[PDB]
Structures are given as C-alpha cells and as structure tokens.
Amino acid sequence: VAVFFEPHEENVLRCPERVLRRLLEDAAVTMRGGGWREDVLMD
Amino acid sequence: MSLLHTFWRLPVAVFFEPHEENVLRCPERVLRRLLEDAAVTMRGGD
Amino acid sequence: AARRIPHFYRVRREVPRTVNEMKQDFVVTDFYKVGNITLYTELHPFFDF
Amino acid sequence: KRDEKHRHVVNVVLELPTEISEATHPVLATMLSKYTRMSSLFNDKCAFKLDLLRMVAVSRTRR
Amino acid sequence: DYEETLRLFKTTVTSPNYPELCYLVDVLVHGNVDAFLLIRTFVARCIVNMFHTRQLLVFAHSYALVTLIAEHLADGALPPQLLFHYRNLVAVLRLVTRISALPGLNNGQLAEEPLSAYVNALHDHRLWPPFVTHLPRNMEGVQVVADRQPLNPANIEARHHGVSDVPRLGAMDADEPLFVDDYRATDDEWTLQKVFYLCLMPAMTNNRACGLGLNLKTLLVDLFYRPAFLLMPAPEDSIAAQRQAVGEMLTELVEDVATDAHTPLLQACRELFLAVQFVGEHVKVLEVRAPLDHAQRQGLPDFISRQHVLYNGCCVVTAPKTLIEYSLPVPFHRFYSNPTICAALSDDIKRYVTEFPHYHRHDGGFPLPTAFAHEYHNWLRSPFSRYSATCPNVLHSVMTLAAMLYKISPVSLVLQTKAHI
Amino acid sequence: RISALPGLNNGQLAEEPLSAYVNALHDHRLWPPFVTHLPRNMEGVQVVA
Amino acid sequence: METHLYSDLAFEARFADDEQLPLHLVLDQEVLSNEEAETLRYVYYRNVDSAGRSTGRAPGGDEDDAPASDDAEDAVGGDRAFDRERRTWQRACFRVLPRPLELLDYLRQSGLTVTLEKEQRVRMFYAVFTTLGLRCPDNRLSGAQTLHLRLVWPDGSYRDWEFLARDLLREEMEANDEVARTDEWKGAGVSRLREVWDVQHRVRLRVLWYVNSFWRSRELSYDDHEVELYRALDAYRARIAVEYVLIRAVRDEIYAVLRRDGGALPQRFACHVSRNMSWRVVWELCRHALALWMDWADVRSCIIKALTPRLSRGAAAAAQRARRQRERSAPKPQELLFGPRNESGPPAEQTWYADVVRCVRAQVDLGVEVRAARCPRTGLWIVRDRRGRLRRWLSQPEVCVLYVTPDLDFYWVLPGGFAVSSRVTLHGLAQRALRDRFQNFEAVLARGMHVEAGRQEPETPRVSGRRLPFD
C-alpha cells in the first residue's frame, strides 16, 4: 500500500536552478545553431 | 528535499485498477535506468 | 543499420511478442481449445491477421 | 613548390618510414603522380594506405 | 545416399574451432571468380592441412567458396575424397532444387515469368538469399533500398579492381552509391544461393548461425602494412624472423593452417596478400521491396513486401577470436541470429542478453532490431525458425524446408493439384 | 536442451526467467556440488562460510 | 488514350483566351497506390511562375501577402481567401485503367503509331491518364515555371506534387472528303517518352509527346534565365518551410513561457502524484523528449493538423456565432418563460490533436487524435481516446505529450500532468503561405453523389479492374 497525492489546481512542480540553466543554454544553442530542417531538404 | 508542492496536506492510499485513474508508480531503479538508457539513445539518431 | 546494431541492444528494455509468434507455441490438439487467445486473428488460411 | 606537398603526402599522410624512398618503389612514384591531384581525402589516411597496398599487390600479379 | 557428406557438414559447421582465416579469405575473394583463381593453391593447401590436423571440412560456411572450390579445385591440389565431399554438397543442392519445382508440368510462362516460379518461392526472383555477392539478373519488381530511396540504375556503379579507385576506398563507410562487381547472378545460381542459405544452412546448424561484417579498411592497413608485404620482389631465413616481419596478428591467423614445409609461412602470406586487390567495401544491410507475383497480387494489391539481405558481409557459425575488435555483429534475419555469437562479438548485446536470459534461446524468438523486426512483411516467418530450431540434421529436413516454400497462389495450387500433391 | 521446454519458456515474471520455474537445473538457487567461480547473480542466494 | 486527344482538342479551343498549352501525363504505381488509383475522384493542377505567384492571384501583389494575426474571427482571411484559392486551382480530364499493362504494347494495340527511338517496354500494374496545362502569358514560355499536381479522393484527402518546366521540357523545345483530326492524330502517333521527377525527387511520372499536338505550330519561344531559376529556387524554399517555422515558433514559445514562470509548472491534467518520486530524472527526461520532438516534428504534427480546419470557410461564421453566444449577459426572465428554448452552450467534451514522444526507445506519434473533457471534481483536463477509452500515457514516466486545442492553445505535458501552456503565434507568416500550403478540399458535384448537400454518401464509385468492366 502506497500513499499518493490528489491532483488540484493549486499544486505545482518546481524546477531546480541547474536544470533550468541547462534547459535555457540548450534553447539558446538550438536557436543560434541554424540547423533548420527545410535547410536540410534544400541542401 | 521538496520539489513537489501539494494543495492537499495529507496523501491518500492508492486503489482501483489502472484503467480508472492516472497514477505515478515509480521505482527509483526503474526511473534511473530509464534516464541513463534514454540519454545515449538521443545522441545516436557541414 | 550496419553499425547501429549495439544501440538497439544498449537499452535494457523488453521487446513485446507478436500474434503469429504467440500462435506458434500451441500443441496440435491444444490449438483449438478456448485457452488459445490467438484464435480471433485466424480468419483465413492464405492471409494472416 | 612541390617538395612540401610531396613530403606531406608521403610522410604526414602516408606515415611511410623514410628508409623506403622514391627510387626503391616505382609504383609509389606512379601513385604519387595521381595522389597529389586530389587535395581532399587526407583525413582518412588509411584509404591512401590501402590503395598503395592493393596497387603493390596488383603489380606483383604474374597475370 | 549422400549422407556421409552431411555428417561432415554437421561436424564442421557446429565446430567451435572453425578457423579464423576462413571468413577473411571468404570476404577477400568476395565471391569473385578471378579472386579465387588468384588464391587457388592457397585455399587448397589450407583445406588439406586443416582437414589433416582437424577432422572437419572447412570453408563450408560460404556458398560461393564451396561452389568455386568444387568447380576449380577439381583438376588438382585436392585429394579425390575432399573434392567428392564438395561435389556432394553441390549435388545435394541440385537434388533439392529438382524437388523445388514441378518439372513435369512447368512448360510455359505467365506474364513473361517462368511457370516454375509461380509454384515455389525458390524459383522466384523476388526472393533474395540472405547473403548477397552479386546482384541478380532480374529486377522487374524488386526495389532495392540502400539508405532511404530506391536505387536508380545511376546510383549503382561498378568497381574496377585493377587501377587506382582511391575515392571508392574513401567512400567505403558511405552507403548511397552501391558499388558492385560487374557481374549478375543468373536464375539457376540464384536458386542455388537461395537453397544453400535457406534450406541447407539452418537445417545443418540448427539455427545457431549468425552474420557479421568487418571494418576491413582498418583491418588490412595494419594486417598487411608490414614492410615485408610492401617490398615484394619478383624467405627461408628463420621462423622467428618471418613472424617478426609478418606481425603478431597474421602469425596468430596463419601459423599452422596453410604453412606446409614445401611452402614457408611468408609465401602463404604473400599468396593471401595478392588477393587483397579485390578489396570490396564495408559490410552493408540492404532492404528488398517487391510486390508479389501477378497471381498472388489479386488480394492486397498494395502489399509491398519488405526483405533484408547482407551485402559485402559473411555468414558465420562461431565467433571469431583474433578478429574481434575489427568485426561487427549484424543479426538481421530470423535465421543467422544466434544470441551467443553476437554476444561474444559485442559488449552491449552481451549485457542485453545477460539482463534477459530468456532471449538466449534460438527458436527465432530473439528480438531483432526494430529496423529488421518486420515479420509479417517478410516471406519467411516464425514457423520456419521454430521448425528449424529443433529439426534433425537429415537431408530430408533440408528438403522439407524447401517444400515449405511452395506458394499459395491459385496457379501454384493448380500445378500442385494436377501433380496430385 | 532436454532439461528445459524450449518451445514454451519464452517469458519472464521476475529476475528469474520461465526456465527457472520449470526446471531446477536452470535457476541459480541450486549450486553445483563443486564450485570455483561464484555465479553471476545472488538475489535470494547467500553464502555462509 | 481518349483523355489525351480530348485534352489536345480542348486546349486548342481555349488557347485564345487561357493561352495554356497541354501536357499529357501518365502515372503508375510509383506515385499512387492501387487503392488510390481505384478510388480517385479529381485530378487538379496549378501553375506558379518564376516569381512565386500563382496563376489566379493579382500580378502586382495581393492582400493575401499581408500577415495573419492569430484571431479566430478573421480566420486567415475568411471565406474570400478560400474563394481565391478555389479560383486558382484548375481541374483536368482523367481516366483510370486498373489492369496491368505496358504503354508501348497498349498503344500499339490501339490505333496510335508509336515511333520511339528504341523499343524498351515499360510495364506498370495500373495506369491513370491525365493532361495538365501550363500557361505562357505571351508566345514566350519560361523554363523557371513550376507546375503543381494534386490527386483527390472521395474522403477529401489529397497529395501535393510540384515540378518545374525545365525538367518537363528538358529536350522538347530543342527538337524544333475531309480528314478528321482523330485520323491524323492516330496516324501521326507519338515519339518521345521521358521521366519527370518532383522537385523533392519523390514521384516519378511519364510524359507523352504527340507530334500532332496543336502547341507545336505556334512557333513559341522558350528560355531559362539563371537569375530566374534562382528566384524560383528561393521561392520554393519559402513555400516548403511553413510547417517547420510554425514548429520553431512553438519551440520558442515553449522556452519563453518556461523562462517566464521561473520553471514552476502547475498541473493542468488530472493525475495522482507522489512526494517521494525523484523528479530530477523526470526533468531530464522532459529535456530529452523536448529535443527529440524538435528533431522529429513533421508536416503532420498536431499544430498543422489543427491549423488546417481553421482555414475552412465555416470557421469564420462559426467563430462569429460562438463569440456572440459567449458575449451575453444574464438572460432576462421574459426569454426564459416565453419563446424559444435557450441556445445550446459549448459542449463538455472537445476534440484535440496531440504529439506524443517517447524517451525509452526512439519513437514519436504525430497525427494522434484525442478527446478532452474536464474532470468535475478537480477542474482539470482528462484525455480520452476516440473510442472513449482513457489515455494512460499520462501515467507512463517515459512519455511527454504536446496537446493543441481547436482555438490554437497548446499544452506541453511531462509526467504527472504538470503542464506548460501558451498560445500559437501564426503571426510569423503571410496569409498566402498558410492558405496555399494547407487547405481542406471542398467537393464539387460529380457522378454518384446526392445533389442535396449533407445527405448520406452512397457507395464509393470505385472504378475497378478486378470486376468485369461495367457499362
């Protein structure tokens, strides 16, 4: 038998600072990379 | 140690078949092995 | 495909069975009994479902 | 000139030891005549090595 | 009564100690007639010596090697017994091919296809042998896929072994241009290949076979880059000097296997060396897409069948030990998918098998890679693996496997029924 | 080969495969009388010296 | 056969006004499946010049070149844009031959004298015959023009192919009682047969050149300027990128709102959670799943599939009606006691489309349909399958799912239902690109269907070769 918490509007899943840092660095690298798929098809 | 924040201040005991509701059953080993296998899989596939 | 073979086995997750392979493992007379769950797919000799 | 590029392809790319010189290997010179004509494919030196190997093999076939 | 040869085949194929150089010479000759003719004496002496020291018939793993051995090595260099064993293997192939078709009734053609092809899949060109050396003569409905798209006749470009080809060696890892020898297998030898790989091999090996491919480019530029091979004049000093000249790997490979006293080790190494000029390329896995024959095509018209074959590869029955680090295991078929061989060849497969011991079995239930795992779209399905995994090694088992490929088409049913089969 | 049931034992319900449940010759809990190497797994097996 | 001759006659009749010359096409099992040939309804073609302008839109530029601004009321231009795109598409005459044949033998067996250079037989399991036109505004034809091809099936589904003139006319322009035109047409025959490929190199189709085609005699001029073809290439690049820039906009919106909320993600889908699950692994799995979705997103992603019905003409009137029905005060007692019953409010269930990505093994699913309803006791979302079954992929720890609503609101979901919510910004692109690349086919009346709209579909016509030919 395990205990679980019931969903509701108030609850929230927080983010660690390091994880958010890594996500935003990946987002910036992806935006600056310029490896667009339509560019691959045009190539 | 707190990343989840809950409205309800006291948890309930799980019941009923998995077809009735969505629950997160999650052994630590299962999750860790899943992550460590998935990480390399994304890298595989000018 | 010639070099990505280890990547498939690199993850330690099971691979589900298929209907035909499950159909193979029944004895001749045991095949027709109600315990055979694969009978609902055996609609045609020349075509499998 | 040509000495720099020739020494490049024979030493930095082919990694062949110095004691095997030009006059001691005529098929080597014949291949080097065409090897320098391409400026790319100098990263997988094993390809040039293999071509030199099988051209040496071709030379010593009595047929 | 060809039985004594089949017992020899069973003993040699299931042998753990099957020699290392057999796979290497198989891929070096690549199934090309000229390459075998260049190395004709070496393979004959190796066969004689290996049969003398070990009571087995080597070279049995590759169809091209055994058929060229049976043909060319007949004139000389072999004793009559071994030649008769190889000829008996070819005779078993021919005997079962006679059973495959219906020779009495198949006089005619339908839609410009031979009437025997409609009866049995052995005679159908849309069925490919799992291992390929040369492309077939017929490509009417066969779309061969190399990377994504079907191979236009412009992407297939013949290799010429005599002069240069530096960019071809550089392109070895690449896939899209399918380099081939300028030869095309005829329908008869196509049927023989299909027979050898589908009927004979799993029956004799009990489905314990496997396929592998080599990083041959990196292997040869260190196995043969020794100065002894470069400076070949147009030996006999000492054994140790020969070993130092030739290298540790080749010494391990060849030392006692082809090195009779009438021809020291270095001469055998040079014989193997001249054959390298027919170098081929890296191993590749090809997908075969083909719609069924015009009689089978009445139902499910859009059924494009997916089939997978190995090109520039090898069929092996035991894991190598001196060629481990330069080899890749490629289980692709539901035959040739032994978990043990590929587990010994690669660490990741070994860990996957040790995690899931129930996959260690050999009844065709081993999980093929998701790319190859299309059972329904294949011509051969689970019952073939299940039957072959426990069948006896009698020749009748081979002919039973051949009989199971009789087709379901209405014309095939007519031809079977008129013969009262 | 004869000890197990090769045509039916394709499955799993623990760390132990189905072959462990059908024959004691496969499962790791029955050690051989003479041993030099300790086996791969000892989940529910303990050695007392 | 008869379609090509009739199309030659018809294009000859109308060349005075339209100035389109006919191009005869035959297609085989490489472009369409046997089912699609057996069930083909309409074949359509559209011409795009070297400037990227469709034949049927104003030459100097149109208001469709202006961008659209995300509002459902003026939904990507309303019905007028649909009418314009209807006007630009032209319909051809086509025939279906379902039995296997080879064109050389079939034409020799017909009255036409083929005269090809070599007697190489070309076999095909089924043949669909069609003839398309390409417009030259004057006696000059350009090699940078591109022609689009569409095949339409009774379910409203369609596929798009486009190829440019210089492949269609690579060598053709360099090769330069009373008689019925049918007689000399058959007696003159055909001699040149070439293979043409789509720009993406995805479809192979054959073109036939009948020597007695009327377009021969006009002594028309042809040329292909290099800058003109460069313009055609860059315009094609602009056309092909619509779905990918939309997906990138979704990516940037996801990252922007993930930055804005400080990484704290509130729950929007109802699922039970545990305080003692390791959520760091969940976060890293979310990162990997997001990267994989960025990689494998396709033209059939949920965002484009949801954008597609927004462009239909019914959307604008439906948006007006829905907004007016929401724009209501409390109802007066008079209307409650007397008169008609109240207008039915929006339903408690909705139809959604979603993209599901898996991290355990490389696998995504894109054209997934899901039904959405709100759980009354908690006010959160519950995802149900099309048959009514509950979707369990929310519980599965290896899965992240992106949902898109009909009103272009999208939810990004990691395990536990904790979600990231933002609106789609279709502001980035001109109305012309969205309206040209994706739009639902609107049926025009033909044989075997009721004239009264909305009636039950009769048996699909299904011209077939497995039966004896019907007459």
Q: How many whole angstroms separate alpha carbon F25 and alpha carbon F14?
A: 17
Amino acid found at E415: L
Q: Which residues contact E88 (CB under 8 A, 6 or more apart)?
A: E2, E5
Q: Which of E38, E166, E218 sits opposite D51 (nearest CB)?
A: E166
Q: Chain C residue closest to G359 (CA)?
A: C11
On whether the CB atoms of residues E316 and E13 are closer than 8 A, the answer is no
* Chains F and E: 3 or more CB pairs within 8 Å of each other: yes
Bridge partners, G323 (sequence order) = none
The sign one gets for the Cα dihedral D45, D46, D48, D49 is positive
User: How far does G437 lie from chain A, in Å, by closest CA?
Assistant: 14
Amino acid found at G180: A
Tokens of E293: 């024959």
The sign one gets for the Cα dihedral G455, G461, G467, G471 is positive
Q: Residue E170: which of F31, C25, C28, D47 has the closest Cα? A: D47
The number of angstroms, rounded, from the C-alpha of E286 to the middle of its chain's C-alpha atoms is 14
Q: Chain C residue closest to E347 (CA)?
A: C6
One-character DSSP codes across G359-399? TTTTEEEEEEEEEEEE-TTT--EEEE-TTSPBP-TTT-TTE
Amino acid found at G84: R
User: How far does E370 lie from chain G, in Å, by closest CA?
Assistant: 10
Amino acid found at F24: A
Q: Chain B residue closest to A39 (CA)?
A: B46
Per the document, the length of chain E is: 421
The number of angstroms, rounded, from the C-alpha of E275 to the middle of its chain's C-alpha atoms is 19
Q: Chain C residue closest to B42 (CA)?
A: C7
Would the CB atoms of B8 and A12 count as touching at under 8 Å? no
Q: How many whole angstroms separate alpha carbon E100 and alpha carbon E119?
A: 8
Q: With 0-12 CB in 10 A as exposed, 13-18 as middle and 19+ as buried, what is C29? A: exposed
Q: How many whole angstroms separate alpha carbon E67 and alpha carbon E89?
A: 9
Q: How many whole angstroms separate alpha carbon E155 and alpha carbon E177?
A: 5
Taking the alpha carbons at both ends of chain G, their separation in whole angstroms is 18
Per the document, the length of chain G is: 471
User: How far does E219 lie from chain D, in Å, by closest CA?
Assistant: 10
Bridge partners, E307 (sequence order) = E288
| F 7-46 → E contacts, CB under 8 A | 7, 9-12, 17-19, 40
Helix axes G181-188, G2-14, angle to 10 degrees: 120
Q: How many whole angstroms separate alpha carbon G449 and alpha carbon G326?
A: 37
CA distances, F40 to each of C9, E357, G404 (Å): 20, 12, 50
Between CA G20 and CA G27, with CA G23 as vertex, the angle to 5 degrees is: 145
Q: Which residue has the tokens 């083929």?
A: G114
DSSP 8-state code for residue A7:
P
Q: How many whole angstroms separate alpha carbon C25 and alpha carbon G69?
A: 61
The sign one gets for the Cα dihedral E393, E398, E401, E403 is negative
SS (H, E, C) G117-150: CCCCCCEECCEEEEEEEEECCCCEEECCCEEEEE
Tokens of C49: 């479902």
On whether the CB atoms of residues A38 and G246 are closer than 8 A, the answer is no
On whether the CB atoms of residues E205 and E317 are closer than 8 A, the answer is yes
Q: Which of G34, G100, G361 sits opposite E294 (nearest CB)?
A: G100
On whether the CB atoms of residues A7 and G394 are closer than 8 A, the answer is no
Tell me if residue G426 falls in helix, strand or coil. helix
User: Which chain A residues have a beta carbon less than 8 Å from that of G280?
Assistant: 16, 19
On whether the CB atoms of residues G74 and G426 are closer than 8 A, the answer is no
Number of neighbouring beta carbons within 10 Å of residue G320: 14
Q: Which residues of E240-275 are buried (b: 16+ CB within 10 A; e: fewer)?
A: eebbebbbebbbebbeebbbeeeebbbbbbbbbbbb
CA distances, G266 to each of A3, A21, E141 (Å): 21, 19, 56
Q: How many whole angstroms separate alpha carbon E335 and alpha carbon E317?
A: 11
The sign one gets for the Cα dihedral G310, G312, G316, G318 is negative
On whether the CB atoms of residues E189 and E122 are closer than 8 A, the answer is no
User: Which chain E residues have a beta carbon less than 8 Å from that of D60?
Assistant: 232, 234, 270, 274
**Testing the interface with A: which of B1, B3, B25 to mutate, by most A Cβ within 10 A?**
B3
Q: Which residues contact G381 (CB under 8 A, 6 or more apart)?
A: G268, G269, G270, G372, G373, G374, G375, G411, G417
Q: With 0-12 CB in 10 A as exposed, 13-18 as middle and 19+ as buried, what is E74? A: middle
Interface residue C11 vs chain B (CB under 8 A): yes
Q: How many whole angstroms separate alpha carbon E286 and alpha carbon E7?
A: 33
Q: Which residues contact B2 (CB under 8 A, 6 or more apart)?
A: A14, G275
The sign one gets for the Cα dihedral E65, E70, E72, E75 is positive
Between CA G192 and CA G199, with CA G196 as vertex, the angle to 5 degrees is: 160
Q: Which residue has the tokens 């190539």?
A: A43
Q: How many whole angstroms separate alpha carbon E289 and alpha carbon E374?
A: 12
DSSP 8-state code for residue G430:
B
Tokens of G1: 């056969």
On whether the CB atoms of residues E305 and E381 are closer than 8 A, the answer is no
Paired sense of beta strands E184-185 and E135-136, if any: parallel
Q: How many whole angstroms separate alpha carbon E22 and alpha carbon E315?
A: 11
On whether the CB atoms of residues E77 and E41 are closer than 8 A, the answer is yes
One-character DSSP codes across E258-300? S--TTS-HHHHHHHHHHGGGS-----EEEEEEEEPPTTGGGSS
Q: Which residues contact G48 (CB under 8 A, 6 or more apart)?
A: G54, G55, G145, G146, G147, G148, G162, G235
Q: How many whole angstroms separate alpha carbon G16 and alpha carbon E260?
A: 90
The sign one gets for the Cα dihedral G439, G413, G272, G407 is negative
Q: How many whole angstroms separate alpha carbon G103 and alpha carbon G124?
A: 8
Would the CB atoms of C25 and F8 count as touching at under 8 Å? yes
DSSP 8-state code for residue G38:
H
Resolution in A: 4.0
Q: How many whole angstroms separate alpha carbon B37 and alpha carbon C7?
A: 10
Q: Chain C residue closest to B38 (CA)?
A: C11
Q: Chain E residue closest to D33 (CA)?
A: E164
Q: How many whole angstroms separate alpha carbon D61 and alpha carbon D58?
A: 6
Tell me if residue C6 falls in helix, strand or coil. helix
User: How far does C43 lie from chain F, in Å, by closest CA?
Assistant: 24
Helix axes A17-33, G279-296, angle to 10 degrees: 10
Would the CB atoms of E302 and G123 count as touching at under 8 Å? no
Q: Which residue has the tokens 């030493």?
A: D11
Tell me if residue E114 falls in helix, strand or coil. strand
Q: Residue E378: which of C42, F11, C21, C36 has the closest Cα? A: C21
Q: How many whole angstroms separate alpha carbon E59 and alpha carbon E44?
A: 10
Q: Residue G461: which of G41, G130, G28 has the closest Cα? A: G41
DSSP 8-state code for residue G407:
T
Tell me if residue E64 falls in helix, strand or coil. helix
- Residue E176 has φ and ψ, to the nearest 5°, of -55, -45
Q: Which residues contact E67 (CB under 8 A, 6 or more apart)?
A: E90, E189, E192
The CA-based diameter of chain B, rounded to the nearest angstrom, is 56
The experimental technique behind this entry is cryo-EM
Amino acid found at E280: G
Would the CB atoms of E301 and G201 count as touching at under 8 Å? no
User: Which chain B residues have a beta carbon less than 8 Å from that of G272?
Assistant: 14, 21-24
CA distances, G360 to each of B34, B42, C14, E332, E333 (Å): 6, 10, 11, 22, 24
Would the CB atoms of C7 and B44 count as touching at under 8 Å? yes
User: Which chain D residues have a beta carbon less than 8 Å from that of E270?
Assistant: 60
DSSP 8-state code for residue F27:
S
Neighbouring chains of D at 3+ CB pairs under 8 Å are E
